[PDB]
């Protein structure tokens, strides 16, 4: 993950509220999340990686070992089962609750790490730099 940490901020967005509809986040929290700016605040440390956040609708943070399930309380309130992996260079970020799942992923590309959230046919993608 020596590509993944920095300290990230958003770039730009697309589809990320249809993304929420399908996660199934309501209107308010869906129209000030997509307001927001977050960045990424991304470090490992032996095997343990965090991914932090800052911005002002929420500051969370997670922190994982690749292959091992965690539990997650995700920004907008779902308590999830989640275990994220390395996929050929690809952080793969999969979120279980409620017999539903969500795919997120998240890669370098050029100068950007790219993160795509998927859920149901839906697919947003949200591009970061470094700040
Ligand atoms: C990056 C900050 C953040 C937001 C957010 C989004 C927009 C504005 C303000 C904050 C959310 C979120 C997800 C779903 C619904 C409502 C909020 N989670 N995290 C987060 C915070 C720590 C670690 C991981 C993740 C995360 C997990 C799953 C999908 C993500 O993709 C959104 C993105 O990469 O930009 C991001």
């Not at 990230?8 to 700016?37: C, H, I, P």
Request: aromatic share 8%; net charge neutral; proline share 1%.
């Amino acid at each position: 993950c020596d590509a993944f940490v920095g300290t990230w901020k958003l770039v730009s967005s697309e589809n990320f509220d249809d993304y929420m509809k399908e996660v199934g986040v309501g209107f308010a929290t869906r129209k000030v999340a997509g307001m927001a700016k977050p960045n990424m605040i991304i470090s490992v440390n032996g095997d343990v990686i965090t991914i932090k956040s800052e911005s002002t609708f929420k500051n969370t943070e997670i922190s994982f070992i690749l292959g091992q399930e965690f539990d997650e309380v995700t920004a907008d309130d779902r308590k999830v089962k989640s275990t994220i992996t390395l996929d050929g260079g690809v952080l793969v970020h999969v979120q279980k609750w409620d017999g539903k799942s969500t795919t997120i992923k998240r890669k370098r590309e050029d100068d950007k790490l790219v993160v795509e959230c998927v859920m149901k046919g839906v697919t947003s993608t949200r591009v970061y730099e470094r700040a």
